[PDB]
Amino acid sequence: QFDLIRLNNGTIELNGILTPKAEVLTKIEKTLNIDELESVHNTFLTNILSHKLFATNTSEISVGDYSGQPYPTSL
């Protein structure tokens, strides 16, 4: 139930409000619709392409030391 967000400076922040442990004063399936499943597919494709070895010809990748070339380039 804990939704965490990692920051580039090592900071880990809890996302949104913290819900109680299912205790409310008392005295179906959480399925995804069309756009949610499409966003799931798109984020999946992104996580695929965002791999470092797949980060070909991008400024965000670091090149191999003593080589001056990105890892997919050397590959």
Next chain:
Amino acid sequence: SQDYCTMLYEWLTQGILNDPYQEFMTYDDLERAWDTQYFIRKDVLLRDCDSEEDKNLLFKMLRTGILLKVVRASLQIPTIPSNSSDITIQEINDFADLMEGSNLELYVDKCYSRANEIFLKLFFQG
């Protein structure tokens, strides 16, 4: 002052802030991301809040309203029903009798103890 005592009863029993004319002595921001700062309008006060007892009473009422708002925000409920605890607070009818009498203090202490009970229960069990 019927309207003002109604608004004060709402603030002390639900933490609901609705002052479109800036006549109530308590308002906050976000009308730090989760924490809003409450500001006490000194011009529209009901007392001088200069003595330690008056300051503590004002702090207690403000804390009661803040705890009510926090409980409403956490439970995602628009209002808090009276059955949430064994404590009930009646609405104020005569403002002068409430001022000269300690029934105001009775109501304040009762709703403060109620809010403390509810908050402690929700945090110790929820």
